[PDB]
Design a protein around this ligand. Structure first.
Ligand SMILES: O=C1CO[C@H]2CCN(C(=O)N3CCC(C(c4ccccc4)c4ccccc4)CC3)C[C@H]2N1
Length: 295
């Protein structure tokens, strides 16, 4: 008699049968999170995390949104956190967009008729933009926290040179250096938390993944004239990773009739984990913006 094989487990050895999950189109398990209110939800909102991190870092934002009577949901992107896949590798950047859409489509089956919002940060903001551009008119709104629209220009040249080198030869292990954690936030406690979290991948960026992030930048630029979704865009003026010029370009080139930019003077990249004055404002402004569009 044949027997069922041992249960599929996360990269951290936890059986997926013990966790909320979804299987993507490539047969890979994605770890999922849900924060639902006690009453009937006013809307759904998907939270899209950034490169090397994971959905658990959105706990406080998600609980705020749940307190507005939205049903919040998320998953760890392939290659990240508690989801399957080689760490920080993706066959094509569109895998991330496809998987968001699968999760959104699945949730709308269970909660039909509700508006759906997207919230994304950094790489996750690029994913959110491409998700909305693929389905014009489908999403009620998008909250973008320092989305990847243009990378730091000096850093971008580095990834472009390395890309051309790997694109010409066979160098599967080539990587750039790791992201300098000190540029993430002026809040030193949050920098220390980032450096302490075992679910964060702090290795150097593999050139193959950097190529896919360059693909995201190129695709985002082409998507802007197709973007009509309402959005709120939050950007630090001293962001050394996602250059503020990208935020201004998004405001200029998106066709959305409802678009708002808030600049945080002197703030670094991870605005929802910045100095308390900035983080409190970020939470408050997202609260107001979503409240006004779900009332
Ligand atoms: O909370 C967190 C923790 O990790 C933080 C760093 C990674 N990041 C996140 O999506 N990231 C998206 C990818 C960029 C990356 C880059 C840019 C400038 C300098 C070094 C690296 C890049 C690489 C190739 C092409 C384009 C852009 C870095 C930012 C999430 C963010 N948020």
């Amino acid at each position: 008699m044949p027997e069922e094989s041992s249960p599929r487990r996360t990269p951290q050895s936890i059986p997926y049968q013990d966790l909320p999950h979804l299987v993507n189109a490539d047969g890979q398990y994605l770890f999922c999170r849900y924060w639902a209110p006690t009453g009937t939800p006013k809307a759904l909102i998907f939270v899209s995390h950034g490169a090397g991190e994971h959905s658990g870092r959105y706990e406080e934002l998600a609980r705020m949104l749940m307190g507005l009577d939205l049903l919040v949901f998320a998953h760890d992107h392939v290659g990240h956190g508690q989801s399957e896949g080689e760490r920080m590798v993706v066959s094509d950047f569109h895998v991330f967009v496809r998987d968001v859409l699968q999760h959104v489509d699945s949730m709308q089956k269970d909660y039909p008729g509700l508006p759906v919002f997207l919230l994304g940060h950094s790489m996750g903001g690029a994913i959110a933009i491409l998700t909305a551009a693929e389905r014009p008119g489908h999403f009620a709104g998008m909250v973008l926290i320092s989305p990847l629209v243009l990378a730091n220009p000096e850093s971008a040249t580095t990834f472009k040179v390395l890309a051309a080198k790997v694109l010409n030869s066979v160098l599967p292990n080539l990587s750039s250096g790791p992201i300098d954690s000190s540029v993430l936030s002026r809040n030193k406690t949050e920098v220390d938390i980032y450096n302490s979290d075992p679910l964060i991948c702090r290795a150097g960026l593999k050139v193959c993944f950097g190529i896919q992030l360059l693909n995201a930048v190129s695709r985002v630029e082409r998507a802007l004239p197709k973007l009509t979704v309402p959005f709120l865009l939050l950007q630090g003026s001293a962001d050394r990773l996602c250059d503020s010029k990208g935020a201004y370009l998004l405001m200029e080139l998106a066709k959305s009739q409802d678009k708002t930019l808030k600049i945080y003077e002197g703030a670094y990249h991870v605005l929802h984990k910045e100095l308390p004055e900035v983080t409190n404002s970020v939470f408050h402004e997202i609260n107001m913006w979503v409240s006004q569009r779900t009332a």
